[PDB]
Design a protein around this ligand. Structure first.
Ligand SMILES: NC(=[NH2+])NCCC[C@H](N)C(=O)O
Ligand SMILES: NC(=[NH2+])NCCC[C@H](N)C(=O)O
Ligand SMILES: NC(=[NH2+])NCCC[C@H](N)C(=O)O
Ligand SMILES: NC(=[NH2+])NCCC[C@H](N)C(=O)O
Ligand SMILES: NC(=[NH2+])NCCC[C@H](N)C(=O)O
Ligand SMILES: NC(=[NH2+])NCCC[C@H](N)C(=O)O
Ligand code: NA
Ligand code: NA
Lengths: 258, 258, 258, 258, 258, 258
């Protein structure tokens, strides 16, 4: 996929460039000049991560070093594109998440902060985490554990704490909290299993599990484990049914009768 | 109202300039030196939309182009000022929405992006949409249809999706979603009719009508059509009462069970 | 506390400067160069409040004037750091709130805006409030009355309106609104007494008392006075339980009924 | 010439845009999207004049105001383009002076500052003068009187003082001074008449005439009036020959002893 | 003087502020808000010294530290203002060199680099020296020794090397070199004694003395000691007469018959 | 030389990072992070060439493409560093030209512009040339032919035109012009052969030979071929003597007759 995904992005960019002379250079410098998603993504992220104390051009090298050391980062990033193209009716182009969508930017920003975290460069990981919170309005602790094929749609107000886990193929909307409880260190954030769909505004708190292919109703406050393949809703949330599909993250059906 | 509004804005600006030497030049350059709201607003929005790849000065031209081609836009903008002064007790000056309020900026930004969208300049429309999301923390699809006399108070976390309709004289607080459902293209976002008030944090999802003068309680999750002149609250929302005025957007009474 | 807090911040700063060469100069310029919290905080705050019309270097002088004229401001700033270290398991360094946390930045920003407001410098206070709202995604009316030992964790989407009161030792999470009701001037915003804990996404509206040591459940919509030492939750919120500690803000137990 | 010049500039810009994808947006935003030289030039000069205290976008309005009030300014500007294309073998394109050459920018900058000066806006005139000195390394007093068909080639170190006069059709190379003498106010700068060429590094000092079609050799120091149609060279300069054309500014023959 | 000079600057600034609304805030933030030349000068210099790697706000502290450690720096800076007001017919206001003139900026920038040099902070002094060369087009080695009452008029292209000395009351115009000879370390730059006037373009090379109250002809190349109270001119320079006055720096008479 | 030069630069950099905490990160980001001159030089050059229309991060990719495509460019850059250390008594560190010296920046910038020009990318080469002229105050036509071991000391005002040739081991000071004559295309700029030294402010014009090992006196105006191993000086320049060394550029003896 990752190779075909890149070629399509370049094809789309050539077309957009021709269509919009105000953005022709933007499309060229970010995408068309480049050979790989890595080069395009590092540019775009460095611009979002830009601060007075560490300009974009300096930031880009850090991003490039993470991408070179861990090939899985760029590849997750390509899987995250497909996920959003597939699940979001408002996105029908592969170049869109890469260029435009702050939830996508914050997610790949996270991957870089996480790599830093894992190298022991914790100050710099904290610095990136909090710049992303300011610039993308998404707050993901660098020690969170996040899989691939993830869609963060709209994303304003997403909060993902330190010991949170998000497995492959999860879809999360604006204003979702995967939050902690208490003042003590240790496991205290939710574990979101594969295929889970989380509607706008949901709050999930404590070290609790959300089982495979569960659906979390929009506006839910979840304080206890959610069984696999159930739909929950309410404040606090209770089981209200069973999702129409095996992996409700892929289908994005917001209804809660099930 | 249009020129009374402009003349009041200029008079307030002169007074504020005299009072705050740190901001005299800001008041002069945005307001006092200008003949219309168009020139003031193009300047202020240009600064909000500013990015590395397209600086304010180049952005201003695109804003001015939309204003010159569609006169209703700046008409709507003046109308939105009066909306905010009338409805929001924390705002007693006509220059305040214009100068300061990110909800106001996001909304006028949408008008320009919508104009772009309507000319087939969709990449630039998308560019502006997402820059506004980043800068004003309000995400409105440029294809959404929004009337006039709209107040977006505080505004952080507002999402309004592709096929949404918002009629004249609506009030919408922070963290409100007018959201979609499913992965399929097609009509899938709410239709908010005239006079509706939407309390903070409400989520409304799917292609459902919210009838004229309905009141959506704070924190509500709305999945079904709301009868006109009805008050809904809860997760998921149900009818809890009926508003006394025909247009609760005008009065901003946040109490429900009434 | 004052001196011990600053000396600890300097020691951490020296330690971090040695671990991270990309940030050695950042740590030196903000912290290690300085002999008080005021110098460090004015610098960091100036950068966050930076706008085209009033650049950091200029803003910084305004912040310092406030710090010199009202010594209670830096003291409160010191107290809030301790509050965050003690209460947030993800923060174990005193220099972290100062340097990184937008909720912290926003709160100390409010303190400068409030001082300006108390001087009659209202245009500038409003300028500040709304820049903080855009840059930190926290919107606090400069006329709000806020005590000390306050933690705003994560903070995206926090709204605190004109007549709101927040006493000492309160903890408030992302997406919380202390909001108003109606279109008229007058007292209309919540009074949050000492010891209160407000979970993510809670909406409290109108001139209502939230009693000493109450806990407000995540996602709650509060329309009526909350008795002291009570836990409320729901949409609309009802009594679901009672906290065990006198000041649930100190413990951050998100559980309810609880 | 005026609209042939503009139309040629637009045609060249379209070709350059096609050739250089890195600069397509630059060519479009400065030239291709515009109807006149005025709009192109106001954009380009605004960027050159940009400073912390007055950004390009605000500067553009002042430039456009001068252009609207005094039509001769943009007339002069087009005439200066043709001067540079005709006289300078390294320049074969009409868009080149407009886009690239700091001598050209400094000169059109002076026209705007001179307009300001003539309206009594002397602080802003002085602000622009000195910003041009810093940005273009050309220092022209706004009260100087400069005609049209002027070429400032390379331009670094050009100084032209308060009471200087430069007539139409003059050519002036880098490091040329039209300088004053004494500490007293009053007429004390050269009068350079029509057709004069001034070679690199020439210094001309005091209220002295340089007669029509005189040629000032490179490196000359001129302290006395120069007869029309005369060639001077040396430190201090003396007559060394006579030019064959009536207007050596047109031919740029740098040889002397002839 | 230094006290009266400051009060006049504030009086002038209040007047300019009232005259030019585009610059009212600029005048307020730089001058009117302030109590001393130090505060105004550090602001203005920090803006000129601003680079990506060390923003203005960071630079200002370094400047302020030099001013606090060595009171003679601010006081020389006030004497340099008077010198230029007195000697330059184009400057009749005390606020002008401070705000506008790059030769003045470069000179006071030098004083700060020199203080750094003397403290052993040689990297930072070199960094400031070369930023001033880029931003003001004046290259003064931090180890140069420069007195007070100095006017650098127009200044483009001034070069003052490592072992150069400039005593009190010297006036230097654009494109003057006080330059070195050879490839060996040690004394190799000129010693400009008190009262000396140096015309535009002069080149003075080698460890040679220019005696009190000498006049250096514009465009002179000086390779041997110049006797006190003589006028030299030519390439290479010879004695052509005697200055009309005791201190030709004060009178600025460019004539060279004497 | 290559490897030894880079290793020395890194060692100095480490040393300077420890002496100056304000610059530790600057030294790390430009030098210590990197394993070749190319990475360090591309970064520093990008920042100098930074413009609104093409920011540093984007420019950097263009510089690197040139460095990769033509290995002779970095080699020449290495050689020029050595030339400056050896010849300028005020430079004893190999990292100084790289980091600080605009003449060095401008020359290496020329090398990128020249490469672009040789690819047919002439708009971009012209864009670069003129940005260098504004930012470094050196104006070198991209079609000029320049060798290696070149020192441009101080550099303000240097002009080198289209058909100029500069062979290896040439030293050129501030305010030197290698300039053209006439309005026609064709060979018209000087040929400066190996070993030549050009003193401050010298003007050499027309398609004339400056022979191997010549010395050009400061302030000279050269209109005719200079024999090899000759010293010329004056306006216009005549033979005044003969250099003792074969390559006066290596020794920098400014004396004439000499
Ligand atoms: N130099 C600066 N202004 N840095 C501001 C950003 C610091 C830190 N990355 C944050 O999240 O806020
Ligand atoms: N190349 C750039 N970073 N340009 C400005 C930022 C783009 C902006 N964040 C967007 O959403 O489109
Ligand atoms: N011209 C500007 N710099 N405007 C900045 C944004 C306006 C104002 N600072 C605000 O509250 O949002
Ligand atoms: N406050 C500022 N620095 N504004 C922009 C720079 C001013 C500019 N250098 C001048 O000569 O006037
Ligand atoms: N980070 C930067 N871009 N620094 C550029 C300036 C460096 C050094 N002060 C100089 O004179 O050039
Ligand atoms: N729009 C811009 N960024 N222009 C920058 C100046 C133009 C061009 N870089 C030059 O050679 O001077
Ligand atoms: Na899609
Ligand atoms: Na004067």
């Amino acid at each position: 996929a990752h190779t075909k995904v890149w070629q399509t992005i370049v094809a789309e960019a050539r077309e957009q460039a021709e269509q919009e002379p105000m953005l022709a250079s933007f499309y060229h410098a970010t995408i068309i000049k480049h050979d790989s998603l890595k080069a395009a993504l590092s540019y775009i992220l460095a611009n979002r991560l830009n601060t007075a104390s560490m300009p974009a051009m300096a930031v880009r090298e850090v991003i490039e070093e993470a991408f070179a050391a861990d090939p899985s980062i760029s590849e997750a990033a390509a899987c995250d594109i497909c996920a959003t193209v597939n699940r979001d009716p408002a996105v029908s182009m592969y170049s869109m998440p890469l260029l435009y969508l702050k939830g996508y930017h914050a997610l790949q920003g996270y991957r870089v902060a996480n790599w830093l975290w894992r190298q022991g460069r914790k100050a710099l990981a904290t610095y990136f985490q909090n710049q992303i919170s300011v610039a993308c309005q998404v707050d993901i602790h660098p020690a969170a554990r996040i899989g691939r094929g993830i869609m963060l749609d709209h994303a304003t107000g997403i909060v993902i704490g330190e010991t949170a886990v998000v497995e492959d193929d999860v879809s999360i909307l604006q204003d979702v909290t995967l939050g902690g409880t208490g003042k003590e260190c240790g496991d205290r954030h939710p574990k979101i299993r594969e295929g889970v769909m989380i509607g706008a505004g949901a709050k999930i708190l404590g070290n609790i599990e959300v089982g495979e292919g569960a659906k979390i109703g929009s506006g839910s406050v979840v304080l206890q484990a959610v069984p696999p393949h159930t739909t929950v809703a309410g404040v606090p949330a209770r089981i209200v049914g069973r999702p129409q599909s095996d992996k409700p993250s892929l289908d994005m059906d917001q209804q809660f009768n099930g």
